[PDB]
């Protein structure tokens, strides 16, 4: 059975905790501490005890509750409402295959609903499952469901999703969470647990375009130039032509050649796979043409470069900078094997680290603990990819004065 990770999103009070609880309760996957507490067993009491565990400091990320369906192992890896929510998503400590977006039937789509959807697209979460919750509070009415569904469809289509399920539920009474409802004959689609069972396996790194961040470069007498690095995505074959960026951009000519040979642990290979630490001999490339922090790809889909005349947009969490960060801040960005100075050109939004809600557009400054959406200009060219496309090259750290200031993920690149 494939393993799959999910996150719950949606506006505060719309019923994320209650839906998780209902999933746990109806599958009998009650947390052990709660089973012990018990040693009457109604749903309401269990919700009280899940809430109490939360207040004792057990957060969903830490609890990482799991259940089984006929075709999946499912881990609930995170949800808004706890100190390190945004940090876990940005760093990649929590990686989700799917997001369950909970929208209350009583309120509809709210501004924070839309914000979490954007956070989901940004992270590269390809699979959305919408629940329209609290159906019991609107008399199980189809028209209400249909009116909220249309709001949801409009939002998620604008974002680029398509053919996600929209399931009317009552986390509180149980309808369509695990057990098919008998109150909504007008709905014929999956239950939430059925929709979870059908989350597709994640795209494999081998199927993404080739990226190999270069760690070091050798020039061996009578063999030639041998870069060393890790295959992050795609696959490398003897015979392949590879191009190096930002080498090619900096030199205004293609720094590229044919792979004469590959080696891992000083033993020959005919092909290298994701995770392999390799040396490779490239013909027609001079030792001086490439260096640590270059990245190799096929000429087909060369590694994306942000030039000094470009900018990129990132979401960050500020880890350690107690004084104000303002426009013009110029620390050092570390990503894969590169390090380059970067300038903060704009701070577009301040973001709530607990929830991923926007706190403020165009704030003047940010500090330790803030999350933010920022536009950065590299002072030397750098290979970066949007995390939603090639996550292995979409995360970075910001360093200044010996310490780690922030961690970030790349949202987009602005060609200048």
């Amino acid at each position: 059975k494939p393993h799959v990770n999910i996150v719950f999103i949606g506006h505060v009070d719309h019923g994320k905790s209650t839906t998780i609880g209902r999933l746990l309760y109806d599958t009998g996957n009650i947390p052990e501490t709660i089973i012990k507490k018990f040693e009457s067993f109604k749903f309401a009491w269990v919700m009280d005890r899940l809430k109490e565990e939360r207040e004792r400091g057990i957060t969903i990320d830490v609890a990482h509750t799991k259940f089984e369906t006929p075709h999946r192992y499912i881990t609930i890896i995170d949800a808004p409402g706890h100190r390190d929510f945004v940090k876990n998503m940005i760093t990649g400590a929590s990686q989700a295959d799917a997001a369950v977006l909970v929208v209350a039937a009583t309120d509809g789509v709210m501004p924070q609903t839309k914000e979490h959807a954007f956070l989901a697209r940004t992270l590269g979460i390809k699979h959305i499952i919408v629940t329209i919750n609290k159906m019991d509070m609107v008399n199980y009415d189809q028209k209400v469901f249909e009116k909220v569904k249309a709001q949801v469809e409009k939002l998620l289509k604008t974002l680029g999703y398509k053919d996600f399920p929209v399931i009317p539920t009552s986390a509180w009474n149980g309808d369509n969470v695990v057990k098919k409802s008998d109150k909504m004959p007008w709905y014929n689609g999956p239950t939430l647990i059925e929709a979870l069972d059908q989350i597709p396996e994640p795209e494999k790194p081998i199927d993404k375009p080739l990226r190999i961040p270069i760690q070091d470069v050798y020039s061996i007498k009578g063999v030639g130039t041998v870069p060393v690095g890790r295959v992050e995505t795609g696959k490398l074959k003897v015979g392949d032509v590879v191009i190096f960026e930002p080498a090619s951009t900096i030199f205004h000519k293609p720094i590229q050649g044919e792979v004469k040979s590959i080696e891992m642990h000083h033993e020959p290979l005919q092909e290298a796979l994701p995770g392999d630490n390799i040396g490779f001999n490239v013909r027609g490339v001079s030792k001086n043409d490439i260096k640590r922090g270059d990245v190799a790809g096929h000429t087909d889909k060369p590694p994306t470069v942000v030039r000094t005349k470009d900018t990129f947009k990132a979401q960050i969490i500020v880890l350690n900078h107690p004084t104000a960060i303002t426009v013009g801040y110029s620390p050092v960005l570390h990503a894969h094997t590169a390090q380059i100075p970067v300038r903060f050109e704009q701070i577009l939004a301040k973001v709530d680290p607990r929830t991923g809600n926007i706190v403020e557009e165009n704030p003047q400054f940010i500090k330790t603990g803030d999350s933010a959406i920022v536009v950065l200009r590299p002072m030397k060219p750098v290979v970066l990819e949007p995390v939603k496309e090639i996550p292995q090259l979409g995360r970075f750290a910001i360093r200044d004065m010996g310490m780690t200031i922030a961690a970030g993920m790349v949202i987009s690149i602005q060609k200048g």
């Binding site: 501004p111 914000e115 954007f118 940004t122 577009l348 557009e361 959406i373 987009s412």
Partner: peptide, 26 residues
């Protein structure tokens, strides 16, 4: 019917907000 105009205005405002989000995350 002032109420209808106000609902539309508020609806459009929310669409403008969506567009601000598209720009922010674009």
């Amino acid at each position: 019917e002032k109420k209808e105009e106000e609902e539309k205005e508020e609806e459009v405002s929310e669409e403008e907000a969506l567009a601000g989000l598209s720009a922010l995350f674009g």
